[PDB]
Amino acid sequence: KVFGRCELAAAMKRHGLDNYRGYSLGNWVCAAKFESNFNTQATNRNTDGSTDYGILQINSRWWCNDGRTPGSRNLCNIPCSALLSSDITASVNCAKKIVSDGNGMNAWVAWRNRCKGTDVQAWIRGCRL
């Protein structure tokens, strides 16, 4: 599913991401825009053989099992395919574990490079939340 900007803001808010570990909603919507362009079905292969999955491009080296990342750790305890669903629940629950890991949202390279220190509130502007 390809989310609309405000539709996704609303789903993320409902799933408890607004201010989760201090990151306002706008940060999460900005990260999703640049990671996956709001498409829950996005996949991208990394040079090391791992793959990134879903709206927040969560990586198979650490976070999920895809059966093809030798020495992967499956920290979210979830097949990576579960992260491609139109229901964002699995992605959201896994993202919560990731952002708690010590590096905050810096774990998402597009967030660091494209959202960090920008006016992220613009991403939720005009939405009914």
Among 36, 40, 59, 69, binds Pt ion (CB under 5 A): 69
Q: Is 119 annotated as a binding residue?
A: no
Residue placing its CB nearer to Pt ion in the complex, 17 or 105: 17
In the complex, the smallest distance separating the C-beta of residue 119 from Pt ion, rounded to whole angstroms, is: 25
> Which residues form the catalytic set?
35, 52
Among 2, 11, 75, 127, binds Pt ion (CB under 5 A): 11
Closest CA to 24 of 120, 95, 128: 120
Residue nearest to Pt ion (CB): 72
For residues 79 and 66, give the distance between their C-alpha atoms in angstroms, rounded to a whole number: 6
Residue placing its CB nearer to Pt ion in the complex, 48 or 119: 48
Closest CA to 59 of 100, 24, 108, 118: 108
Q: Under a CB-based contact definition with an 8 Å cutoff, are residues 92 and 15 in contact?
A: yes
In the complex, the smallest distance separating the C-beta of residue 113 from Pt ion, rounded to whole angstroms, is: 28
Closest CA to 20 of 83, 90, 94, 100: 100
In the complex, the smallest distance separating the C-beta of residue 68 from Pt ion, rounded to whole angstroms, is: 6
Across the chain, where does the E strand assignment appear?
43-45, 51-53, 58-59
User: Which of these ranges, 38-46, 48-56, 61-69, 90-98, lies near Pt ion under the rule CB under 5 A?
Assistant: 61-69
Q: Under a CB-based contact definition with an 8 Å cutoff, are residues 57 and 70 in contact?
A: no
Q: Is 72 in the site for Pt ion (CB under 5 A)?
A: yes
